[PDB]
Write a protein that binds this ligand. Structure first.
Ligand SMILES: OC[C@H]1O[C@@H](O[C@H]2[C@H](O)[C@@H](O)[C@H](O[C@@H]3[C@@H](O)[C@@H](O)O[C@H](CO)[C@H]3O)O[C@@H]2CO)[C@H](O)[C@@H](O)[C@@H]1O
Ligand SMILES: [Ca+2]
Length: 259
């Protein structure tokens, strides 16, 4: 644990709900709120990931019964022009180009995708990617790898602090049946620090050292929100279980609060 936290977190009294997807409207996700990422479908995604991210394909991404569903399936989508030879299909939505925020309280109420192989993530990257990943800054509000399906990881990545050179600032907790019941995964982002939590408890704290160094604190610029279920890489440490497909993360809501 490299960024330990141990404090309550709650939507601050002086914050307003400024953006939300309650996923009230069945069908396609709202195009004013999400776009699909197909950027590396043909090439293969990073982290040696095994999924194809299917755009506009209800089998992988749909709003149903108040939830965003992101669903992994074992299938080869060979009719897709950007098909990259993948054994699996999944979904990746982001608010890139639609919505971002500089500081704020983010609350995502979600049931995760389980099964050896599955790697559900709720995270943020900076709107200004001029510095690239990992320099731009990225916030992992929730990662789980389903070989360890009760363990919730909360992580930040910057130039100084990132997985590529094993200096990432993160922590972990556990949650009851995270693929069978809903938890709130939460980020409290101020100019001074980040808390990352489950259910109103921060297990993760990263402070702005206030040195004005982009390397250690790139978090004074807007960030957009990302929802996906990756397959393989970190999620594939105890292999990929054919039997576990299909597997789905249900997102009840995304709610963003600001001063
Ligand atoms: O490898 C260099 C390329 O990185 C691309 O950035 C990726 C990065 O490679 C990848 O490892 C990273 O993965 C993320 C996880 O490690 C963790 O942060 O949680 C995220 C949710 O699981 C997960 O996807 O993502 C980076 C951004 O996609 C650069 O985009 C590319 O320009 C560069 O050459
Ligand atoms: Ca809902």
């Amino acid at each position: 644990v490299t960024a330990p936290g141990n404090e309550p977190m709650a939507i601050p009294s002086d914050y307003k709900l400024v953006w939300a997807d309650e996923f009230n409207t069945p069908g396609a996700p709202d195009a004013k709120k999400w776009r699909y990422d197909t950027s590396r479908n043909k090439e293969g995604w990073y982290n040696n990931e095994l999924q194809y991210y299917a755009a506009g394909r209800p089998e992988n991404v749909r709003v149903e019964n108040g939830n965003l569903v992101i669903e992994t399936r074992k299938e080869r989508l060979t009719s897709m022009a950007d098909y990259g030879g993948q054994e699996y299909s999944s979904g990746k939505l982001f608010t890139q180009g639609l919505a971002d925020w500089q500081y704020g309280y983010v609350e995502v109420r979600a049931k995760l995708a389980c099964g050896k192989g599955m790697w559900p993530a709720i995270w943020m990257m900076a709107s200004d990617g001029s510095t690239g990943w990992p320099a731009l800054g990225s916030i992992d509000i929730m990662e789980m790898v389903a070989w360890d399906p009760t363990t919730i990881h909360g992580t930040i990545h910057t130039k100084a602090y990132n997985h590529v050179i094993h200096t990432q600032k993160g922590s972990r907790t556990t949650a009851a049946d995270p693929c069978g019941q809903f938890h709130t995964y939460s980020l409290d982002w101020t100019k001074d620090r980040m808390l990352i939590g489950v259910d109103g408890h921060a297990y993760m704290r990263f402070d702005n050292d206030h040195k004005g160094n982009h390397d250690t604190w790139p978090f004074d610029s807007p960030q957009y929100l990302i929802l996906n279920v990756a397959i393989g890489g970190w999620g594939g440490q105890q292999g990929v279980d054919a039997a576990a497909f299909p597997s789905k993360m249900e997102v009840d809501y995304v709610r963003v609060y600001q001063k």
